[PDB]
User: Fold this.
Amino acid sequence: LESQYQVGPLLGSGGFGSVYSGIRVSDNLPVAIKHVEKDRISDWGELPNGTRVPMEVVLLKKVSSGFSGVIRLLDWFERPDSFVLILERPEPVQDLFDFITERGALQEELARSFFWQVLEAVRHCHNCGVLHRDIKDENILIDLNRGELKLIDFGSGALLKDTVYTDFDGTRVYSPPEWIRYHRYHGRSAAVWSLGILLYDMVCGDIPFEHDEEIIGGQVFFRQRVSSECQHLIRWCLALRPSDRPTFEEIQNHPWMQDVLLPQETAEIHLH
Amino acid sequence: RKRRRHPSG
Ligand SMILES: Nc1nc(-c2ccc3[nH]c(=O)[nH]c3c2)cs1
Assistant:
């Protein structure tokens, strides 16, 4: 376990655990090494082995088959008081929160490419039976050479279901008004709300709401110049009534979403 | 205007 990887410096820590940069010695592959304390684990799941693992491990295995816009789980290990997760590490990389901090409001062409890739990654999770429950710019990595976005941190996720959720541990300022008001939500429509928050974040340079009262107020003020078509998509994603929000298909068929850049064009035009 | 990270988990 400590002989398969060379351990580098802390990339960060927080509600997810402590995450370290690392190198797989078998082939010098860059990895990220995440430690989670068993005592902090809320939801437990099981896999085919019937082995009892954190839910986060269950969800990562379900989305890690094949290529996608999700950071893949390469291995994991159980220790006395913790689990250790070996995850992909793009290099060079910046998370979308720091990217928006340094660059400000993104050009619509660039927000379109990013938002499209986030939609494809979330659709992939949903195809695999996985609800992420914490979509935000902090949980998105940008591979700056390939121009590809990658979703991280499934620590608040769940199996996707069609009945109501009554628990939530994701980020409150991205959570929907029906959660704020009634402590209930359905998975896809709550995901769509957080994608509205994220899109506003990208084209305006910060999220629209900080306080419960703004979240349930249903008023979107645009602080940057944003095209009418983009404003319409955002306001649709942020409809107060869940049933009034677009499906993923309606988002991707929206007129603002047409003629997206390829990932490599995005890197060359905006990131190199 | 103050932009900040927000915790979860
Ligand atoms: N700055 C960088 N952070 C990662 C990374 C990769 C996977 C992760 N899963 C988590 O919950 N946190 C993660 C962080 C790679 S480069």
Notes: The pocket of 8MZ is lined by residues A 11, 16, 19, 32, 34, 71, 87, 89, 93, 95, 141, 152-153 (CB under 6 Å).
